[PDB]
Amino acid sequence: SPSLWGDQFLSFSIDNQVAEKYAKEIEALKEQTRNMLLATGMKLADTLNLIDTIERLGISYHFEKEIDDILDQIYNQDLCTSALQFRLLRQHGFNISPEIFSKFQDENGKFKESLASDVLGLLNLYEASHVRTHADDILEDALAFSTIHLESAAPHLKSPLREQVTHALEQCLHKGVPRVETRFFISSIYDKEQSKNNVLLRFAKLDFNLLQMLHKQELAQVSRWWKDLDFVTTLPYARDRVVECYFSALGVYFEPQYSQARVMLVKTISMISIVDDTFDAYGTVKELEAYTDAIQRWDINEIDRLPDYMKISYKAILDLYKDYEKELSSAGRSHIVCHAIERMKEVVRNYNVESTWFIEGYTPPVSEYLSNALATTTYYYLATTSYLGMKSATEQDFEWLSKNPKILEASVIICRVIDDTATYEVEKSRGQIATGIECCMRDYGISTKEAMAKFQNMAETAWKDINEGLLRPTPVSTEFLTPILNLARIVEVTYIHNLDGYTHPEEVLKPHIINLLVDSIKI
Ligand SMILES: CC(C)=CCC/C(C)=C/CC/C(C)=C/[C@H](O)P(=O)(O)O
Ligand SMILES: [Mg+2]
Ligand SMILES: [Mg+2]
């Protein structure tokens, strides 16, 4: 499919006038909200609720500290309140004990079925059940419990609750994309809340709409940068998904301070997409081998062994990193670009092996499979690329990333296992007997069902691992853990109808793209 979008995102003339109007009133709403947080005699359930709402609306990135000091204090000092308190502290790194859920369970470890009539309690427990780590076996039955009752109780709930419950049973807050969920909360829920806080709603719509202007600009910038390359008329075999790449970079981070980073990350994602397309639906055994080698060396002098068409990809790639080296200059962080590069070569290496395995009809043992198939997700790559733009990222931080941290390793597994479950049958048809599930089935001598079932558990384990990763002390500043977390969210979001949303956007991403980069939240 050619691009659903077309030249539509190419032009964007911001109404500075409008943007200024929005900015000014927002600053005034910022302070009003700030003072809401600083209120002295508030109850626990009112404070936890306040913070929950500000976060969901997507304006919590303004009061990053105010909210931290409040949770810290709440950490150093009913089901609904408990689970919420749990989730919020945990998402922030505070390792609060699960024995809070003790007083809600029987002597036999399970939850009292007498709670089945507490919807708000069941709901917040459901959301909290997704941020559990391996040491939280107390919450082993939290999800199936709250789910079954939520489903049963939802059809007769008043709105918007009913709509909030039905949506959560399809997508939990923790594992969803921030912008996407915020767009859902503001318009479909909080705006329709009878007790909604007018100041916070107003604040929430302006802000979301204002940052949408910036994203619209960014995407424009990237849409012109993508036409001046003409891989649309030059390299027809490749996928034109620059908008979808932007959604991915927007999923990694949306704050305005990451404007430089996002644009950097979009160019990479788009770029590497081409290379997979080359190795997959185009280049030949020899051509690919010549391409992988070319990449590994890295010096334009080689654009020669490469066929004419691979010459274009290769040059574009090298110039992109030269641009990167150039953008950074001002700060003096050009010496970190290499980090992204060594990862890219790693992706290219495996891409090659992947093909080699396809020609020989090799069906590796799962062990050997992942050792190679993990990087081909490009997740170490994007993770490493996401830092480039972050003005705070140091060498000592990339060094952390280069050792393949457990949080990153788990983010990558989630992207691998889910992708292999969602694209088994298709990839198979094409003769690729090297696909996850296959190696799994033959390796463990199990059915397709059992193989997928075992891959799911890998993902669950992975999540439990990512949740631990967020706990303090954090190996690096939380600021650099979130990009990894979000990447995993993006996987969970893109393959929900259990299907490639980036290779088949229409049913999954299109909507998000429309609600995030097209339609503004009507005030
Ligand atoms: C689902 C997610 C988050 C996708 C991230 C995007 C990425 C850089 C795409 C490049 C090309 C891909 C991925 C092809 C196949 O899908 P494959 O890799 O399966 O051969
Ligand atoms: Mg490939
Ligand atoms: Mg796949």
From Swiss-Prot:
Its main location: cytoplasm. Changing residue 249 to T: Relaxed product specificity leading to equal amounts production of 5-epi-aristolochene, 4-epi-eremophilene and premnaspirodiene with cis,trans-farnesyl diphosphate as substrate. Mg(2+) 3 binds at residues 419-420, 423, 427. A motif (DDXXD motif) lies at residues 276-280. Keywords: Cytoplasm, Lyase, Magnesium, Metal-binding. The keyword ATP-binding does not apply. Its cofactor is Mg(2+). Binds 3 Mg(2+) ions per subunit. Belongs to the terpene synthase family. The Asp-Asp-Xaa-Xaa-Asp/Glu (DDXXD/E) motif is important for the catalytic activity, presumably through binding to Mg(2+). This is 5-epi-aristolochene synthase. It comes from Nicotiana tabacum (Common tobacco). The gene is EAS3.
